Amino acid sequence: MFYPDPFDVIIIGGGHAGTEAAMAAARMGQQTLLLTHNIDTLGQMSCNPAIGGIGKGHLVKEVDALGGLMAKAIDQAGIQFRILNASKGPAVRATRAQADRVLYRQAVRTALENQPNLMIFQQAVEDLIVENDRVVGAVTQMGLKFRAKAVVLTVGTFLDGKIHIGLDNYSGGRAGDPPSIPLSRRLRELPLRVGRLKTGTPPRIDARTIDFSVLAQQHGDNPMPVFSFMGNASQHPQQVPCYITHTNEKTHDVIRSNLDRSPMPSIEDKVMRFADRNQHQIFLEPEGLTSNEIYPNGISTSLPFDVQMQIVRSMQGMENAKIVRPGYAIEYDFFDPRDLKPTLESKFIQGLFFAGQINGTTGYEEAAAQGLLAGLNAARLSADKEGWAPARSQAYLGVLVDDLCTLGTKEPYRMFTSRAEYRLMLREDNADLRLTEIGRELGLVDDERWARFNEKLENIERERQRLKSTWVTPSAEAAAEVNAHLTAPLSREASGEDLLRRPEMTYEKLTTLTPFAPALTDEQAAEQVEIQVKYEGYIARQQDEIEKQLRNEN
Amino acid sequence: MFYPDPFDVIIIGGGHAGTEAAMAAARMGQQTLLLTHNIDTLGQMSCNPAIGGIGKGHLVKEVDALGGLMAKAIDQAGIQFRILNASKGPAVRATRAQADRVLYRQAVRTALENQPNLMIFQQAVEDLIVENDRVVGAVTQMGLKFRAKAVVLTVGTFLDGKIHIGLDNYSGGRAGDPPSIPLSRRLRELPLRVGRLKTGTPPRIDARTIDFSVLAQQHGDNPMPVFSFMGNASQHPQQVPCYITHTNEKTHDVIRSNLDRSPMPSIEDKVMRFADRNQHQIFLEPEGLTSNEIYPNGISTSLPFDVQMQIVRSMQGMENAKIVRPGYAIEYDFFDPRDLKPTLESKFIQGLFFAGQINGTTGYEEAAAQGLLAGLNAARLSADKEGWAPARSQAYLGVLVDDLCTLGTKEPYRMFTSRAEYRLMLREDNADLRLTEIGRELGLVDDERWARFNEKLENIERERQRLKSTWVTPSAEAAAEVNAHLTAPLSREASGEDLLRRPEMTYEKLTTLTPFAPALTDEQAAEQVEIQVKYEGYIARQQDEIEKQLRNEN
Ligand SMILES: *[C@]12=NC3=[C]C([C])=C([C])[C]=C3N([C][C]([O])[C]([O])[C]([O])[C]OP([O])(=O)OP([O])(=O)O[C][C]3O[C](N4[C]=NC5=C4N=[C]N=C5[N])[C]([O])[C]3[O])C1=NC(=O)[N]C2=O
């Protein structure tokens, strides 16, 4: 039997990719159906309760710039915010946040519920229905089939796996969840390449059995950074610090002695590879404001339960620690990204897209970006329009997509800054400047975001124009104060743009100086103008490099 | 392998029964292990987001009086509060609350997290380990066994079942959950009688596709009632009303025509049994303050999906309604309560208890009460002390337990007021008076509850003594005002107790009268004193009946 209404875009799964795909397709204006086997599980961070960092904050910022949901959700569910590489240059600076699991899950679900044009159905999909190489719809478990023009596939066989703990194992997608054996087998029936990977997670520690009085703390920055360009600081809930402990030589001895038990990143591999090192660093991270669990970062393994208990008790401050949920390793399948076009569409089957974990990607953020691109392109194919795949010179999503499609991967792929060929211009602060307009050309950007972006652009342009017009002469009285804040006194009249390019000074002092005061009321605009001017020489050299490379690129 | 530490009480499952059992055993002061297969699912309402009513508010109040958790949790997660049978006599009135699902789940989880002496471990248990008829411990899935003296079993084979939807079916304990096939089969391997039952639930409706402008509303009372004796009104979150619609003759025609498709309480059975009736009543109940789902009460069936869609669209105001989660019926097993002693212990296996859904009882409250009793008795057996089982003349839990153990049941058992042999004294307002002291004799009652109870008893006794001492004479000036509020003028000096026994007057007017003013500052004490005096004649007659019946009872 067929559901009475016809749908245009069908998003299977409910991961992070499914969330982004549904939001994008519905926001564009098409009729969308999201199929999931458990609604209460929507927006669940499987293992690491953290978002952002080096090579992943850029993806989140791009998704936000196109109109995604991850940045706003994390602002609403973030408890500690830090800036990595804060001292170093902006091209490398990044943001990271520790995420409360409950708050994040509620924010995602509430955001999905209120989306117009979106219908969510809680039923497991067992098959795909196709007619002469064009996918027509999906088939659920109870026998009800849905029809649509474009289908985005998320977790077809990712959930076909087995949890491995020590010598034992049992089929399961995650901690106590059913496998997607039907869909995985069905997809395997199709002619595509398949590879196998494994992922391991460490145990959770009861918070009450650990002594925090003997450990050092790390706290967030001040003032707190905000991910999305629209959001501000006050949205963030109350903040909690993380604690730091160090593995002992006794734990090294335990791992060395007991590695034979392992069936074989992981703690045991980390110790084996680096025998010279004698101690590590471990971060205890809260799993919520209303939870008594501690996530230890950096003790991963597949060691049996008793070994894990020994290892965690051997560490400082965790003599009496108790484990609420054991660590474990899980297998899963995926399909090689070498068969997907630059828009993520499958060449073997028409109308079919692959996104997220099914493309051998671990992190939450990379899965979300893949999902946004695949959902956007499936919706565009629905309305019979051209697809849009970013260029490697456009944004980090472009680099990730191109590498996934062409180079391939025999293992999980992790984004890195060094992989980006255009690193000095691909900066988080300007991510929106590189995508918002194009987003508005696809309809993803709504009115408030567009108005804010246009105001930002106008302020940047006006401030730059005034800077170029401004002229400062050494003969002025303030020149003395200018000479106070200059390595050498002025010899001839200098413009604002010329003066600010000096590596020994920044826009702060110019704002302090009467001629260059006052400053832009918009902090992001002021930072962008400072980057353009102070880094005007380096930015110009990089622009020359970009032009030279794009000559062959174009 | 064996977990290093030895535990005394082991609760299996994580339902409402398991929640109560763990809380009671830990409160007593023993080392408790609660085993479950998903911590995120703790305290989940599976069928109806409602707690209380007729024959079930009494159980919740008894659990609260003993020192349970359901009353406080519901006060913290309830959105609409009503009093059923408010106009009628106190021995029949009851409380009901429509409760948010998310808030309730959070409250239960946080309450279990901070319980001293309690260790929660998340891993499915596959077997029981026994040594010459005495259960020694439990066996999980990964191969780690736990040892203890008393074991309370909750869902050993309840989760062994199949969801039936229309013609199709598939194994599952609930919507998208794994079955407990291993434990159920293992228990079946034991020599006990087993029966099969089935339960059905209706679909959830998207809230955005229903028109609430054409429906009547029902709102809670004012001031709001509070379940627990310790709690007050302000704890309750913001309140939402329910909406009412009525099934049409068209839906009756649909059910009559399509009942053949059903594989066969249920809507179809309700229509078939009462052919004379032409219309029903349906209540649309919110599933949370932050959810877009509507639970329709009274359209249950196992009808296939298209039939359910027709039925829900035929009803008034739901022409365009859409279904997020389909309705369905699930099978499950259970063991006849005729093999359990009055304390719930199994005669076939020593040290083994059965509680909750495994005893046939369906509702949340009956399962919770069974769990409290079974956990208390398992803890007492752990410390080698005498078990405690209530008498049918003591509290509704006593009646439920005795009927379950003695009479038996071939189907789910639902508590009713009429089943209670002592209905005029088994009143909710005095439930604590009948249990708190005994609870303190078992240690379940902590210090704050005991102090409040003692203050309540002292106030009741003092007010009663003053009432008996008080004498009112017709010769006083206020007697005129007394004659104002009396059917007949006073002929001789009358005491407070004598005057208040008049069916034509209540303690309110006595408080208004100068001699009987002021009133007790404690509302519960004032109500209890009014019940004792005004119903002094009826209560005395019932006390005589109780004594006569207990002569044979003792
Ligand atoms: C139902 N309809 C319906 C209708 C009406 C009018 C009433 C009064 C009741 C129902 N119910 C029953 C209702 O849901 C009931 O009150 C309650 O939800 C079920 O009992 P409860 O509270 O004890 O929860 P449950 O399901 O038993 O949780 C068990 C728990 O045990 C854990 N666990 C751990 N290891 C396990 C295991 N379970 C099983 N095996 C193993 N190895 C689990 O984590 C569980 O959380 C209706 N019920 C229904 O299912 N459908 C209806 O339509």
Ligand SMILES: Cc1cc2nc3c(=O)[nH]c(=O)nc-3n(C[C@H](O)[C@H](O)[C@H](O)COP(=O)(O)OP(=O)(O)OC[C@H]3O[C@@H](n4cnc5c(N)ncnc54)[C@H](O)[C@@H]3O)c2cc1C
């Ligand atoms: C350092 C690091 C460590 C990591 N460690 C782990 C680890 O130890 N263990 C681990 O599991 N992951 C691990 N990950 C991956 C991480 O969990 C991912 O970011 C994310 O949790 C999984 O991808 P996803 O966002 O797409 O969610 P998904 O898991 O892919 O969610 C898929 C959704 O599809 C829905 N669905 C609906 N119908 C079906 C169906 N028929 N079949 C399947 N699903 C269906 C499901 O409800 C499910 O919620 C790690 C990542 C990093 C960076």
